Amino acid sequence: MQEHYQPAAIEPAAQKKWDDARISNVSEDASKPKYYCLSMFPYPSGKLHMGHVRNYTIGDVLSRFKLLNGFNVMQPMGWDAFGMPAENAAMKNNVAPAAWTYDNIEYMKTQLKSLGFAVDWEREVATCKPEYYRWEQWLFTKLFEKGIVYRKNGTVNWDPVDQTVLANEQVIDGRGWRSGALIEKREIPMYYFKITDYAEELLNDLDKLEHWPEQVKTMQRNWIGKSRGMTVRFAVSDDSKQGLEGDYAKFLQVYTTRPDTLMGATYVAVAAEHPLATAAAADKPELQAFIAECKAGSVAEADMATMEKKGVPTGRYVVNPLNGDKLEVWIANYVLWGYGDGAVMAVPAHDERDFEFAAKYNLPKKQVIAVGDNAFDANRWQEWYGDKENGVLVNSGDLDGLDFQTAFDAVAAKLQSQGAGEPKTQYRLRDWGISRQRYWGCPIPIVHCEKCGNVPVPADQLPVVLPENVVPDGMGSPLAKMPEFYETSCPCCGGAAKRETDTMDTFIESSWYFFRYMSPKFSDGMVSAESAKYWGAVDQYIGGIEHAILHLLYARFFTKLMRDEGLVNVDEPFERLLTQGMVVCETYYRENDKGGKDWINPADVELTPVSAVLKADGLPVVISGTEKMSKSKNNGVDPQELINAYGADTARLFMMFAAPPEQSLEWSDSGVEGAHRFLRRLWRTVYEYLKQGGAVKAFAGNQDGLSKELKDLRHKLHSTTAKVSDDYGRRQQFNTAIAAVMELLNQYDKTDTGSEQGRAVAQEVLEAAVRLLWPIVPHICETLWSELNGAKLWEAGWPTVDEAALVKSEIEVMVQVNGKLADLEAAALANIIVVPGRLVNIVV
Ligand SMILES: CC(C)C[C@H](N)C(=O)NS(=O)(=O)OC[C@H]1OC[C@@H](CCCn2cc(CN)nn2)[C@H](O)[C@@H]1O
Ligand SMILES: [Mg+2]
Ligand SMILES: [Zn+2]
């Protein structure tokens, strides 16, 4: 055994020992209990970043821990290969997106294997291969004939200079983010998942997830946005029916979730596309411009509530069906056409958004709810204005005194008796649009025939192979400029027909890949029925918070779709969900000659502790703020150079010890040094132990007769084993478990283990400490364990807790004052010469 810890020699050898033993290549074996630990598969973007290392080390600690406890552990790995980054690099470096992708995969695979992750590489998938996306094209055709997938005209943003579609997040003040040209709203036919048909199922099944973060379940409930309200119809006054047709000339219909406050409606609001808005804007140019500004907007829903609410009066009036008040109709920019009826009622006294709107335009406010004896200020909003559980109605005629639920049913009675309203349930959830005007994506298995219509590709002709021999230029999606691809024959009549040139949303690949890992080479379906029954569902899911809404909801939607098709037997894909925090770093720059800043990568800097300067230039730079690692402010720390400088075990240990997994991790140069020096200490601790006698049989059994010092070390040992096991399986806080093993080595250093019984307790401490640290630093623990014990580490198993070593030794004693029944005198005074051991006597 070498005296000094050199990871470059022990990490490759330990990896071959694991690959030769094939301990990570697991099977559907009904002998050992299964465990499915899954980390979110990455985009093959070129190199791994620190966010990748943290996410996949967390998954590996959980996997190696469950494996050491006797589980059949599947930790698969794959690549989310479809996406825009491949097209952008294709335009930049003049290469094919497929070629650019496959070289990033084979390089990032070498980085992952160097870190020593226990990954079953015989289950590796790649979403850009036809052997994978053929099955989401297959599920597309099935759900398309059922109507779950349907084709419908939709509105998108078209950049007339970059010649492509842009999402709302890529539009800035009406212009494209790159071209800077005004975008055009276009109505094009697209495809949709009918996810609204599963809204009640996706909402209620969140209650089954007793091991999900409560905030993730909360965010999904708000996104679905179920609401039980009331449809209300306000009759249009006779002086306002000009230019209206159909039922719009008879009434204005709205939806509200608080019909108990219908007596407090001071005005109504309609969307810019509403017929009442169109009839009012016929001769007033101020309304025409307001409608045009609303249509030209591109507010993303992540910022929809943060936009300034604006409105214009129409001069038209409707009648409240309960008190007969004439309410003026306004055109509001926050009312979205297609969300319900496209028209709402406003109660400024009990809705904060209506309060700020009325305060802006000096609109009336009518209090109709009261909570206790609280004062109602018409010029200041209070939190109790919108309370529902502890309020009673006021200023509502024959509705005064009713609470929320009784007034709700009372209002429904009057509305239904008049035929002016009825209860209705609504959902904020929209359908899922999957059409993408991109090249590097899964083709949509639709063929357009002038006689048969939109025809799905039959199952025999799947997949519709995307040609990998394309280099996009940037002047339109290449699939539309390639007749050799879209010119085809109709699979129904054989006539001339064209293929769909739009590709699928890349979220479709990530929505079911966790099932494909169970049988990645299965060629007769999405997932083999035998492997789906064995693995069931993912036991542990690890990923970032940015996928808590869209990706997680899509994965649950696909799981219920595949369940209703007969492929799987679970309602939910993920049992446990761990949300890893981001990784941040310090930013550096220099001042530009034009009044700006040019950012510098931290690796190209060196600090004096005081100021900082370049590594080779000696030009003093300026240190800036700390934020998430990104190429924006050029603060990304390459983990490969970290592996080159310290090895894989130091990188894994630093990220597991710097902060808890949910908390953000700040990069620290001195932090990775403390991780490396601790691994040097652990190596020296085992070396110096074997240097004075060698290995012995670790202590086991009855500990009676051991010294007080050695008994205290065994107590600390089995306390650490119980503390680490609870930190891995339950708390999932890996930084606290590292310090627990560190404190065990502290007491070991302070304990004389030179005796014959001392050597045995020392062996028991070290054999457990290397197994307690194996999930975090498997390379050095594998090497050190083979020096202490000759058995295979994974067959020795997770350290067992000896509960006898935790029980303290008691000394029963009798206490008689004056004959009748230093620490013993203290307890016998909490009840004077004492005979040592059995008698204490209180000199009365
Ligand atoms: C299931 C799919 C939708 C996953 C998708 N292919 C994806 O997000 N792929 S990815 O390659 O983008 O991320 C792979 C995984 O591991 C890294 C995590 C951290 C990302 C944020 N971050 C970055 C830093 C410092 N550079 N600190 N935090 C990430 O959330 C994810 O869990
Ligand atoms: Mg349960
Ligand atoms: Zn046809």
Side-chain angles (χ1 to χ4, degrees), residues 1 3-91 93-128 130-141 143-144 146-177 179-213 215-244 246-292 294-303 305 307 309 311-370 372 374-376 378-379 381-388 390-450 452-474 476 478-480 482-497 499-520 522-532 534-589 591-593 595-597 599-605 608-609 612 616 618 620 622-630 632-683 685-696 698-707 709-755 757-806 809 815 819 822 826-828 830-831 835-837 839-842 844:
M1 175 180 177
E3 173 186 18
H4 295 144
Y5 162 64
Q6 187 49 244
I10 77 176
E11 294 188 351
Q15 286 162 6
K16 197 199 71 162
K17 191 185 191 181
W18 301 325
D19 304 328
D20 294 338
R22 291 180 55 90
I23 59 176
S24 300
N25 313 111
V26 293
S27 163
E28 291 80 47
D29 158 272
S31 176
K32 287 160 59 179
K34 64 100 181 182
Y35 190 80
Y36 190 174
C37 188
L38 176 62
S39 301
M40 294 185 180
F41 62 157
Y43 306 117
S45 64
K47 305 180 306 173
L48 300 181
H49 51 58
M50 298 298 297
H52 286 136
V53 182
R54 188 178 189 186
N55 196 89
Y56 305 143
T57 304
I58 288 173
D60 193 57
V61 176
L62 297 172
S63 298
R64 295 183 176 273
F65 167 67
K66 282 296 180 180
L67 184 88
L68 279 183
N69 280 265
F71 282 87
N72 194 28
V73 177
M74 183 169 72
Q75 182 169 228
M77 213 73 177
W79 314 99
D80 205 339
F82 275 145
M84 268 301 295
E87 280 195 43
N88 290 327
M91 303 175 186
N93 304 333
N94 189 22
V95 290
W100 180 90
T101 298
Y102 292 135
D103 292 301
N104 300 338
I105 285 181
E106 86 166 282
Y107 178 79
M108 292 167 77
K109 186 178 188 178
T110 308
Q111 292 184 297
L112 287 169
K113 292 172 86 68
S114 66
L115 277 171
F117 295 141
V119 167
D120 189 359
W121 285 112
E122 291 171 347
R123 296 180 177 267
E124 179 187 9
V125 305
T127 57
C128 62
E131 30 262 85
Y132 179 86
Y133 65 75
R134 66 172 305 189
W135 298 116
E136 58 191 29
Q137 288 178 334
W138 177 90
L139 184 59
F140 186 97
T141 57
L143 302 174
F144 184 85
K146 278 183 161 62
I148 296 183
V149 177
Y150 66 94
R151 199 203 188 203
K152 180 203 245 292
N153 269 343
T155 294
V156 301
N157 315 285
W158 169 261
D159 194 321
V161 167
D162 279 337
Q163 294 285 300
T164 185
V165 181
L166 295 182
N168 286 325
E169 299 79 79
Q170 289 94 83
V171 179
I172 304 154
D173 293 295
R175 306 181 177 276
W177 73 272
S179 64
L182 292 174
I183 62 102
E184 306 181 7
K185 306 285 185 177
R186 290 193 181 183
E187 198 181 21
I188 65 172
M190 293 178 297
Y191 303 89
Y192 295 95
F193 271 102
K194 210 164 191 172
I195 195 175
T196 57
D197 283 9
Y198 292 77
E200 188 73 20
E201 187 169 335
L202 289 155
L203 169 67
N204 297 335
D205 279 2
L206 285 165
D207 304 335
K208 299 175 173 178
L209 310 172
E210 288 161 294
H211 291 87
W212 276 33
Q215 58 147 355
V216 173
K217 295 186 292 180
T218 294
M219 286 182 295
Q220 299 218 348
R221 294 190 180 101
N222 296 328
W223 188 262
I224 300 176
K226 179 183 178 179
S227 59
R228 306 183 73 191
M230 186 104 62
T231 300
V232 186
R233 287 181 282 274
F234 298 77
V236 181
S237 298
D238 294 84
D239 49 316
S240 304
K241 293 160 165 287
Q242 204 70 20
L244 304 166
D247 290 5
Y248 289 92
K250 317 177 196 299
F251 56 81
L252 167 71
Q253 181 172 284
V254 310
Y255 171 84
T256 175
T257 57
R258 303 216 56 189
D260 60 315
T261 70
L262 177 55
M263 301 295 297
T266 58
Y267 64 99
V268 295
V270 301
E273 298 88 341
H274 191 276
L276 262 176
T278 301
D283 61 330
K284 308 150 186 283
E286 183 64 29
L287 309 197
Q288 302 170 1
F290 187 86
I291 294 178
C294 294
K295 294 182 176 179
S298 307
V299 181
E301 208 267 339
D303 310 311
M307 78 166 186
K309 324 296 178 180
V312 288
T314 60
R316 310 300 186 93
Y317 291 88
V318 296
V319 177
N320 191 321
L322 255 59
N323 54 30
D325 298 325
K326 293 227 307 178
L327 310 182
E328 187 166 24
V329 184
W330 282 61
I331 299 169
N333 67 335
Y334 66 89
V335 182
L336 297 186
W337 183 255
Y339 269 87
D341 291 314
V344 298
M345 81 181 191
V347 184
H350 309 291
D351 177 283
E352 190 183 340
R353 184 194 59 193
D354 297 333
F355 189 94
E356 285 169 31
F357 196 96
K360 183 189 214 174
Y361 300 112
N362 195 246
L363 294 172
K365 306 196 185 69
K366 203 235 184 182
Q367 174 188 11
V368 287
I369 313 293
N374 298 335
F376 172 80
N379 289 5
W381 166 271
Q382 302 183 250
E383 200 80 300
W384 73 273
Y385 285 3
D387 191 2
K388 304 163 56 186
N390 324 115
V392 291
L393 269 63
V394 298
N395 309 317
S396 297
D398 60 81
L399 297 166
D400 298 5
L402 310 175
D403 56 0
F404 161 78
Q405 184 45 65
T406 312
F408 190 105
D409 296 336
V411 169
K414 278 72 158 298
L415 292 176
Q416 286 183 114
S417 300
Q418 302 180 15
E422 68 284 327
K424 186 177 73 174
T425 302
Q426 288 242 298
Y427 298 86
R428 252 166 49 92
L429 187 67
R430 299 298 110 181
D431 272 349
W432 181 11
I434 63 104
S435 301
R436 289 303 185 267
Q437 291 73 29
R438 310 279 164 259
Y439 156 71
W440 191 236
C442 179
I444 294 178
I446 294 288
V447 177
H448 308 291
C449 169
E450 276 304 308
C452 308
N454 324 104
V455 177
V457 174
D460 294 289
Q461 316 300 84
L462 288 179
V464 179
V465 177
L466 179 70
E468 302 197 325
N469 185 72
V470 179
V471 179
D473 49 273
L479 282 184
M482 292 167 60
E484 63 274 19
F485 170 79
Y486 61 77
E487 292 195 315
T488 187
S489 73
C490 171
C492 278
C493 74
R499 298 183 179 274
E500 177 63 54
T501 55
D502 287 0
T503 54
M504 293 188 185
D505 182 16
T506 59
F507 271 117
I508 295 188
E509 297 96 50
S510 53
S511 299
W512 72 283
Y513 72 109
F514 43 88
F515 282 136
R516 189 56 178 177
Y517 282 137
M518 305 178 179
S519 57
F522 187 62
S523 62
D524 289 304
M526 306 188 69
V527 55
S528 158
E530 311 88 80
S531 50
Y534 175 77
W535 298 105
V538 183
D539 289 303
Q540 182 71 68
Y541 203 25
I542 306 105
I545 191 60
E546 74 275 13
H547 295 301
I549 301 180
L550 295 186
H551 162 51
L552 289 186
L553 184 69
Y554 294 153
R556 297 174 61 217
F557 178 50
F558 261 61
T559 300
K560 306 179 190 303
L561 288 172
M562 297 175 60
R563 176 210 59 199
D564 294 353
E565 291 297 318
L567 290 133
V568 293
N569 282 288
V570 287
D571 305 322
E572 290 292 331
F574 314 113
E575 294 291 331
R576 301 250 270 171
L577 180 63
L578 182 140
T579 316
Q580 164 230 342
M582 62 177 55
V583 179
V584 302
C585 180
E586 206 163 305
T587 48
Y588 314 83
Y589 69 97
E591 228 165 57
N592 281 332
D593 60 303
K597 304 179 189 65
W599 299 94
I600 304 300
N601 187 279
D604 305 11
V605 202
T608 51
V622 45
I623 66 120
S624 174
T626 297
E627 48 171 78
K628 167 187 169 181
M629 295 182 178
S630 64
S632 173
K633 286 192 174 60
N634 196 20
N635 60 336
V637 173
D638 199 327
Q640 177 63 32
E641 293 275 59
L642 172 65
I643 300 174
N644 293 339
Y646 300 100
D649 275 357
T650 306
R652 298 164 56 112
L653 181 64
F654 164 71
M655 311 195 75
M656 299 305 103
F657 185 71
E662 303 89 7
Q663 195 187 305
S664 296
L665 184 140
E666 182 177 26
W667 173 260
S668 180
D669 286 323
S670 67
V672 313
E673 300 175 10
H676 195 68
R677 272 190 278 98
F678 170 73
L679 289 174
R680 298 231 297 254
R681 162 184 177 177
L682 180 63
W683 185 273
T685 304
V686 177
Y687 170 85
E688 293 182 359
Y689 163 78
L690 297 167
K691 202 189 185 66
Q692 189 99 17
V696 297
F699 181 88
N702 170 39
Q703 68 166 21
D704 286 1
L706 271 185
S707 57
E709 300 77 2
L710 295 183
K711 277 182 174 176
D712 290 332
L713 186 52
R714 289 204 75 217
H715 178 88
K716 185 63 174 179
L717 167 60
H718 299 283
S719 68
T720 307
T721 296
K723 203 271 183 298
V724 168
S725 299
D726 185 79
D727 281 0
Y728 286 171
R730 192 183 67 82
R731 302 182 56 256
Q732 289 174 349
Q733 281 213 340
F734 312 97
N735 71 286
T736 62
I738 299 174
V741 184
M742 288 170 53
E743 294 172 10
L744 168 60
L745 289 178
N746 293 335
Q747 181 155 333
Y748 167 87
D749 291 329
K750 306 170 180 176
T751 305
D752 185 8
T753 58
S755 69
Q757 61 185 239
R759 295 281 298 175
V761 178
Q763 182 92 11
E764 191 194 7
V765 169
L766 299 183
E767 286 180 355
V770 295
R771 294 186 290 168
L772 290 168
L773 292 175
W774 193 72
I776 301 180
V777 280
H779 307 90
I780 186 176
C781 293
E782 186 81 40
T783 309
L784 291 174
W785 166 264
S786 298
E787 295 283 358
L788 301 170
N789 192 311
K792 286 171 179 287
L793 199 157
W794 48 91
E795 275 167 72
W798 188 245
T800 78
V801 177
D802 196 331
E803 293 168 64
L806 303 179
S809 305
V815 275
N831 191 339
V835 166
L839 190 272
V840 193
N841 185 217
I842 296 181
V844 74

